[PDB]
Amino acid sequence: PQITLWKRPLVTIKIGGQLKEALLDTGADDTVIEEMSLPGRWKPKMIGGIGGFIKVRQYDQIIIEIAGHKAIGTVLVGPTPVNIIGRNLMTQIGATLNF
Amino acid sequence: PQITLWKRPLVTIKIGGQLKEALLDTGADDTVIEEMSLPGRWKPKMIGGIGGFIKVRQYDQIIIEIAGHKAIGTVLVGPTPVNIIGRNLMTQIGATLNF
Ligand SMILES: CCCC[C@H](NC(=O)[C@H](C)NC(=O)[C@H](CCC(=O)O)NC(=O)[C@H](Cc1ccccc1)NC[C@H](CC(C)C)NC(=O)[C@@H](NC(=O)[C@@H](N)CCCNC(N)=[NH2+])C(C)C)C(N)=O
């Protein structure tokens, strides 16, 4: 679908079998999801943003559905104020910025 | 144009008579530009992101050119690690997300 930006670009995602709402973020290299239990092996990582760095748990090759489109890649789980879908998964579903 | 997300979506912007590179961020509600001596009246504000909040100076009715497209709105100036063009300005150049 073509998404305008008058409102935050929020979409429904399915992760670990459960439904969540996330923000399509072109300014995020990675995908960061709020703290949750996810079946899998993880490794600690640190990511940075506008206010600084946060510790996250890195999960590889996770199957996630973003607005009905399937993607399989890295998902970081930690104390983010909001769930964000970064470029790593957006490229998988073929998202582009147009104007 | 159509911008793919393999790399960070950076564009050239013109502000206060200066040319710089900025990141098109659909996950940013506001526009944040690196510290610069802009003339005019401003008001203190604190903006947050991943990691926390930073103090910025809010300037209204700022004329900016994003990739050859003129826009006008609020611009926050502060110690940001990178210039960020948010939704407030992206909606003015008719930018959309498509997948
Ligand atoms: C796996 C670890 C290695 C990789 C790791 N990578 C990074 O750290 C890379 C550079 N970081 C990023 O790409 C991060 C997102 C996290 C991530 O993708 O990892 N991007 C970001 O954090 C980008 C800005 C940015 C871009 C590049 C560099 C620096 C900063 N901001 C994303 C962010 C999303 C928002 C929904 C929380 N937006 C904002 O921070 C904007 N804020 C807003 O729009 C607020 N008004 C909303 C706040 C919500 N309200 C509330 N809490 N009451 C701000 C720019 C005006 C590293 N380098 O350590």
Side-chain angles (χ1 to χ4, degrees), chain A residues 3 8 24-26 87 97, chain B residues 3 5 24-26 29 97:
Chain A
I3 306 172
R8 285 181 168 139
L24 293 176
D25 194 342
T26 60
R87 294 190 297 104
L97 259 174
Chain B
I3 302 186
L5 303 171
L24 299 176
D25 192 353
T26 57
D29 302 304
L97 272 175

Side-chain angles (χ1 to χ4, degrees), chain A residues 42-91:
Chain A
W42 63 269
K43 63 296 302 168
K45 286 303 168 62
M46 284 240 303
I47 59 169
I50 228 65
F53 293 82
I54 72 170
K55 297 177 197 170
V56 295
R57 301 187 313 187
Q58 182 186 293
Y59 288 82
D60 294 343
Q61 248 181 275
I62 298 302
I63 302 170
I64 173 177
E65 193 175 275
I66 302 158
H69 297 83
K70 197 55 60 63
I72 304 171
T74 307
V75 174
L76 308 171
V77 178
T80 177
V82 55
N83 302 323
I84 67 181
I85 305 308
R87 294 190 297 104
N88 71 307
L89 298 185
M90 285 196 275
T91 53

Side-chain angles (χ1 to χ4, degrees), chain A residues 1-3 5-9 23-27 29 49-52 54 69 87 91 93-99, chain B residues 1-3 5-9 24-27 29 49-52 54 80 84 87 90-91 93 95-99:
Chain A
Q2 178 167 266
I3 306 172
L5 304 170
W6 301 97
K7 295 183 183 299
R8 285 181 168 139
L23 191 71
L24 293 176
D25 194 342
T26 60
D29 299 337
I50 228 65
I54 72 170
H69 297 83
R87 294 190 297 104
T91 53
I93 66 168
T96 55
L97 259 174
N98 303 262
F99 61 87
Chain B
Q2 176 173 92
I3 302 186
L5 303 171
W6 300 113
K7 311 173 203 78
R8 297 183 189 161
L24 299 176
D25 192 353
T26 57
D29 302 304
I50 281 185
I54 61 166
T80 172
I84 299 151
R87 291 189 300 103
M90 284 188 91
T91 51
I93 71 175
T96 60
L97 272 175
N98 302 74
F99 60 87

Side-chain angles (χ1 to χ4, degrees), chain B residues 38-53:
Chain B
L38 277 183
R41 194 71 292 280
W42 56 262
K43 174 69 186 171
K45 189 181 190 179
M46 270 177 81
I47 49 115
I50 281 185
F53 290 77

